Design an enzyme around this catalytic site. Structure first.
Site, PDB file in Angstrom:
ATOM      1  N   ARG A  38      -2.694  10.498 -15.836  1.00  0.00           N
ATOM      2  CA  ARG A  38      -3.487  11.531 -15.167  1.00  0.00           C
ATOM      3  C   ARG A  38      -3.971  12.602 -16.134  1.00  0.00           C
ATOM      4  O   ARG A  38      -5.041  13.187 -15.917  1.00  0.00           O
ATOM      5  CB  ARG A  38      -2.697  12.154 -14.017  1.00  0.00           C
ATOM      6  CG  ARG A  38      -2.789  11.338 -12.724  1.00  0.00           C
ATOM      7  CD  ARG A  38      -1.877  11.838 -11.615  1.00  0.00           C
ATOM      8  NE  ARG A  38      -2.235  11.227 -10.335  1.00  0.00           N
ATOM      9  CZ  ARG A  38      -1.601  11.438  -9.190  1.00  0.00           C
ATOM     10  NH1 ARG A  38      -0.506  12.178  -9.134  1.00  0.00           N
ATOM     11  NH2 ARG A  38      -2.082  10.896  -8.069  1.00  0.00           N
ATOM     12  N   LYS A 215       6.016   8.749   0.648  1.00  0.00           N
ATOM     13  CA  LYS A 215       5.334   9.834   1.361  1.00  0.00           C
ATOM     14  C   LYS A 215       5.014   9.370   2.783  1.00  0.00           C
ATOM     15  O   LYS A 215       3.862   9.227   3.194  1.00  0.00           O
ATOM     16  CB  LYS A 215       4.099  10.286   0.593  1.00  0.00           C
ATOM     17  CG  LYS A 215       4.454  11.058  -0.685  1.00  0.00           C
ATOM     18  CD  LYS A 215       3.236  11.397  -1.529  1.00  0.00           C
ATOM     19  CE  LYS A 215       3.621  12.306  -2.705  1.00  0.00           C
ATOM     20  NZ  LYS A 215       2.460  12.689  -3.569  1.00  0.00           N
ATOM     21  N   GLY A 373       0.026   8.272  -8.430  1.00  0.00           N
ATOM     22  CA  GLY A 373       0.799   8.797  -9.543  1.00  0.00           C
ATOM     23  C   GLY A 373       1.909   7.861  -9.977  1.00  0.00           C
ATOM     24  O   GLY A 373       2.022   7.510 -11.155  1.00  0.00           O
ATOM     25  N   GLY A 396      -2.926   8.629  -2.344  1.00  0.00           N
ATOM     26  CA  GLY A 396      -3.365   9.090  -1.036  1.00  0.00           C
ATOM     27  C   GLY A 396      -4.845   9.422  -1.005  1.00  0.00           C
ATOM     28  O   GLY A 396      -5.520   9.186  -0.004  1.00  0.00           O
TER      29      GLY A 396
HETATM   30  N1  ATP Z   1      12.565   2.142   0.031  1.00  0.00           N
HETATM   31  C1  ATP Z   1      12.264   3.260  -0.641  1.00  0.00           C
HETATM   32  N2  ATP Z   1      13.019   4.358  -0.422  1.00  0.00           N
HETATM   33  C2  ATP Z   1      12.738   5.475  -1.100  1.00  0.00           C
HETATM   34  N3  ATP Z   1      11.777   5.686  -2.003  1.00  0.00           N
HETATM   35  C3  ATP Z   1      11.034   4.589  -2.191  1.00  0.00           C
HETATM   36  C4  ATP Z   1      11.204   3.363  -1.567  1.00  0.00           C
HETATM   37  N4  ATP Z   1      10.249   2.458  -2.004  1.00  0.00           N
HETATM   38  C5  ATP Z   1       9.543   3.144  -2.875  1.00  0.00           C
HETATM   39  N5  ATP Z   1       9.961   4.442  -3.037  1.00  0.00           N
HETATM   40  C6  ATP Z   1       9.441   5.493  -3.922  1.00  0.00           C
HETATM   41  O1  ATP Z   1       8.097   5.750  -3.604  1.00  0.00           O
HETATM   42  C7  ATP Z   1       7.691   6.664  -4.638  1.00  0.00           C
HETATM   43  C8  ATP Z   1       6.184   6.678  -4.693  1.00  0.00           C
HETATM   44  O2  ATP Z   1       5.589   7.026  -3.426  1.00  0.00           O
HETATM   45  P1  ATP Z   1       4.246   7.861  -3.370  1.00  0.00           P
HETATM   46  O3  ATP Z   1       3.671   7.775  -1.958  1.00  0.00           O
HETATM   47  O4  ATP Z   1       4.458   9.197  -3.964  1.00  0.00           O
HETATM   48  O5  ATP Z   1       3.273   7.046  -4.346  1.00  0.00           O
HETATM   49  P2  ATP Z   1       2.164   7.422  -5.422  1.00  0.00           P
HETATM   50  O6  ATP Z   1       1.595   6.136  -5.990  1.00  0.00           O
HETATM   51  O7  ATP Z   1       2.690   8.386  -6.426  1.00  0.00           O
HETATM   52  O8  ATP Z   1       1.064   8.177  -4.578  1.00  0.00           O
HETATM   53  P3  ATP Z   1       0.219   9.586  -4.655  1.00  0.00           P
HETATM   54  O9  ATP Z   1      -0.716   9.428  -5.856  1.00  0.00           O
HETATM   55  O10 ATP Z   1      -0.493   9.790  -3.356  1.00  0.00           O
HETATM   56  O11 ATP Z   1       1.270  10.645  -4.977  1.00  0.00           O
HETATM   57  C9  ATP Z   1       8.262   6.031  -5.914  1.00  0.00           C
HETATM   58  O12 ATP Z   1       8.821   7.102  -6.673  1.00  0.00           O
HETATM   59  C10 ATP Z   1       9.363   5.082  -5.393  1.00  0.00           C
HETATM   60  O13 ATP Z   1      10.619   5.363  -6.009  1.00  0.00           O
HETATM   61  O1  X15 Z   2       0.101  12.663  -6.258  1.00  0.00           O
HETATM   62  C1  X15 Z   2      -0.838  12.939  -5.494  1.00  0.00           C
HETATM   63  O2  X15 Z   2      -1.119  12.208  -4.518  1.00  0.00           O
HETATM   64  P1  X15 Z   2      -0.588  10.671  -4.552  1.00  0.00           P
HETATM   65  O3  X15 Z   2       0.920  10.692  -4.503  1.00  0.00           O
HETATM   66  O4  X15 Z   2      -1.112   9.912  -3.355  1.00  0.00           O
HETATM   67  O5  X15 Z   2      -1.020   9.965  -5.814  1.00  0.00           O
HETATM   68  C2  X15 Z   2      -1.618  14.202  -5.739  1.00  0.00           C
HETATM   69  O6  X15 Z   2      -1.232  14.844  -6.968  1.00  0.00           O
HETATM   70  C3  X15 Z   2      -1.397  15.161  -4.574  1.00  0.00           C
HETATM   71  O7  X15 Z   2      -0.005  15.410  -4.392  1.00  0.00           O
HETATM   72  P2  X15 Z   2       0.598  15.684  -2.929  1.00  0.00           P
HETATM   73  O8  X15 Z   2       0.627  14.353  -2.203  1.00  0.00           O
HETATM   74  O9  X15 Z   2       1.958  16.269  -3.190  1.00  0.00           O
HETATM   75  O10 X15 Z   2      -0.362  16.654  -2.289  1.00  0.00           O
HETATM   76 CL    CL Z   3       4.921  12.861   3.043  1.00  0.00          CL
HETATM   77 NA    NA Z   4       4.132  10.135  -6.078  1.00  0.00          NA
END
Ligand code: ATP
Ligand code: X15
Ligand code: CL
Ligand code: NA
Length: 416
Positions: A38, A215, A373, A396
């Site tokens: 990022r 999330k 991320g 997201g």
């Molecule tokens: N069964 C589970 N229980 C708890 N955490 C989990 C599980 N499966 C996956 N994860 C966690 O989900 C986290 C990622 O979720 P998240 O929605 O933040 O994804 P992201 O790709 O970072 O999206 P955003 O860019 O929107 O932040 C990872 O750190 C992983 O450890």
């Molecule tokens: O990580 C982000 O979104 P993502 O987990 O879906 O990748 C952005 O930095 C926004 O973070 P937020 O979901 O805590 O508002």
């Molecule tokens: Cl959430």
């Molecule tokens: Na994340």
């Protein structure tokens, strides 16, 4: 999406202070940055500003979810300043706040070419407009303080750039509330929006969405609209347990669960049936006795349930087979959210297996889009960044594009 918006290629920055929202919400493990994706992604816009005579570039971002309380011991952006120096080939000054008289003075009249990174915007409740106090009680920001927060940010530059594609779905103060005459989209914003505009216009079908991660409260609320766009959906990672508890009466132990989303699970499944969307949920799990890399581990199925006090942190092998079957049918894939806690090896097998399948799909012509991320960090960990069609800095944010929305961070830019 930006034909009607001012973008950086047409913003005169010569002699101007530029205040720039970026998404520097990078993953961290053992207190260091585990993926600089990022940060590197914002370098083209930053370098463009400097190369074209900007007086300064002030960078602002959040990191994690500190919920409006200063947490510099856990969510400081100081390490990002260090990493940005190496990627930019130029020096970066880090400030320990993002608003207030000291920040304003440091940004008011900087030396030519100065790059400044502010501290985590979410240490102030006024960024999100709500949060928690230091005792964990929920709190809402007061309107006059929100406006003063936005007014302070606006003083840090003469023109504004938003390159924070990963945060563009959030209508937060730094993203929609900066009051300067020219508000331009950056080159990463343009690159990502252009890619998705083409890929979502007429998707190859079957079009599969893979929704995992942690999330749950936020992303369960995106499924309703996604069900009008895709032909199949995998619901995995932490997302699955809310569905399995409601639909299967499964015991889920201490696994992630969303009380509000549980109330719409049956309606979502009914809509999936109405729209002909095949839903693939996991059927087996790797369990843990605590949320820790070195937890004791076990196995479970939907039929057996997860024991009280244990949590499901990965899917098991029968789930991986069902996920693979869906990937083999797909001609286009959008994936946000790992299907287990892949940062810890005991819980990484399911996500690795799915990555292997998505890579194989790409090689036979599937259009594969992985975003987020943490999800993009799967590509870095297993060296697949060049083996899928597109790795997005938005997770997201990309799902909200798939729903068909205009993202707030884009809407707030200046019109041509
Ligand atoms: N069964 C589970 N229980 C708890 N955490 C989990 C599980 N499966 C996956 N994860 C966690 O989900 C986290 C990622 O979720 P998240 O929605 O933040 O994804 P992201 O790709 O970072 O999206 P955003 O860019 O929107 O932040 C990872 O750190 C992983 O450890
Ligand atoms: O990580 C982000 O979104 P993502 O987990 O879906 O990748 C952005 O930095 C926004 O973070 P937020 O979901 O805590 O508002
Ligand atoms: Cl959430
Ligand atoms: Na994340």
């Amino acid at each position: 999406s930006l034909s009607n918006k001012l973008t950086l290629d047409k913003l005169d920055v010569k002699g101007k202070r530029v205040v720039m929202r970026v998404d520097f919400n990078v993953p961290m493990k053992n207190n260091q940055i585990t993926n600089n994706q990022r940060i590197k992604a914002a370098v083209p816009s930053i370098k463009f500003c400097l190369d074209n005579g900007a007086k300064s570039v002030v960078l602002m971002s959040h990191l994690g979810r500190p919920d409006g309380v200063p947490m510099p011991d856990k969510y400081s952006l100081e390490p990002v300043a260090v990493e940005l120096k190496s990627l930019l080939g130029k020096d970066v000054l880090f400030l320990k706040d993002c608003v207030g008289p000291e920040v304003e003075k440091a940004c008011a009249n900087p030396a030519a070419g100065s790059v400044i990174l502010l501290e985590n915007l979410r240490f102030h409740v006024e960024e999100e407009g709500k949060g928690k106090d230091a005792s964990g009680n929920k709190v809402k920001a007061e309107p006059a303080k929100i406006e003063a927060f936005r007014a302070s940010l606006s003083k840090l530059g003469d023109v504004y750039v938003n390159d924070a594609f990963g945060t563009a779905h959030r209508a937060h103060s730094s993203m929609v509330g900066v009051n300067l005459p020219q508000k331009a989209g950056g080159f990463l914003m343009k690159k990502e929006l252009n890619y998705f505009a083409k890929a979502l216009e007429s998707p190859e079908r079957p079009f599969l969405a893979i929704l995992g991660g942690a999330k749950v409260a936020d992303k369960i609320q995106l499924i309703n609209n996604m069900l009008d766009k895709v032909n199949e959906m995998i619901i995995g990672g932490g997302m699955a347990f809310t569905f399995l508890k409601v639909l299967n009466n499964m015991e889920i132990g201490t696994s992630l669960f969303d009380e509000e989303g549980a109330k719409i699970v049956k309606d979502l499944m009914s809509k999936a049936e109405k729209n002909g969307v095949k839903i693939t949920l996991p059927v087996d799990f790797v369990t843990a006795d605590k949320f820790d890399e070195n937890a004791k581990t076990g196995q479970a199925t939907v039929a057996s349930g997860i024991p009280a006090g244990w949590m499901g942190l990965d899917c098991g092998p029968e789930s991986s087979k069902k996920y693979a079957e869906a990937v083999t049918r797909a001609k286009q894939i959008v994936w946000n959210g790992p299907v287990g806690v892949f940062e810890w090896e005991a819980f990484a097998r399911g996500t690795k297996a799915l990555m292997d399948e998505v890579v194989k799909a790409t090689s036979r012509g599937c259009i594969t889009i992985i975003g987020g991320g943490d999800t993009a960090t799967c590509c870095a960990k297993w060296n697949t960044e060049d083996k899928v069609s597109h790795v997005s800095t938005g997770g997201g944010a990309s799902l909200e594009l798939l729903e068909g929305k205009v993202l707030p961070g884009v809407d707030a830019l200046s019109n041509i």
